[PDB]
Amino acid sequence: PSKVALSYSKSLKAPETDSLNLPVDENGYITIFDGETFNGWRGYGKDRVPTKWTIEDGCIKFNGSGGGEAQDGDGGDLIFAHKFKNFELELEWKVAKGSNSGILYLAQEVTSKDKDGNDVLEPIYISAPEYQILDNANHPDAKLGKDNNRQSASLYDMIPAVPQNSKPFGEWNKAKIMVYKGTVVHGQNDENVLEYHLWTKQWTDMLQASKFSEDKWPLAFELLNNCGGENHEGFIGLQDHGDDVWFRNIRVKVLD
Ligand code: NA
Fewer Cβ in 10 A, N or C end of the chain? Predict the structure, then answer.
């Protein structure tokens, strides 16, 4: 019955002035999804959970209509609205045949001004590194990128999961994402599959060879190159990429 108070925010860029008492296990993992509600969770940029995210059989499901990045209907990415800094997330994930999703971490909610001075919501992924979720056997993204760097558990389009030990579609996979003092490790199915380091020259060089380079996408470069912003922190998010996917046993340990 041990529990810990985690702060959360309820709307775009809001301060985390509310709180949830969540279970914490014997090793410090706080269960952030309760199996039954979206308490603490909301749409990236919204004050409401988009109804394409549902809850069934103890899992968060996305209900995709097949438009990839479109984020059409009552969609968009989903965040657990508590900023983490040094943390280790563990979860299980399952893809339908041919499905694409992702885990986003260190996400900031970012707006730009258009030519009229209105605020425009920028994509979660121009600030947040992404752990790819994919059916590697059927989604064509599996064959794009370089060295299989768009297969499940890759840092999408930058560093491939090696080993690529995904189970086939319809089976539960385990994911781990660890961020500790700038060292990031992805795990998949109880193995560490890649490692990298934020805020270094080599990270800069990696971004300069990406679709988020300073030349191609200045805002993305600025945000990602100082990932997590001034305080190096941000939201865990789940990706709307138009496809059916399920997540469960979502747990985060705060690291010191
Ligand atoms: Na994805």
Answer: N
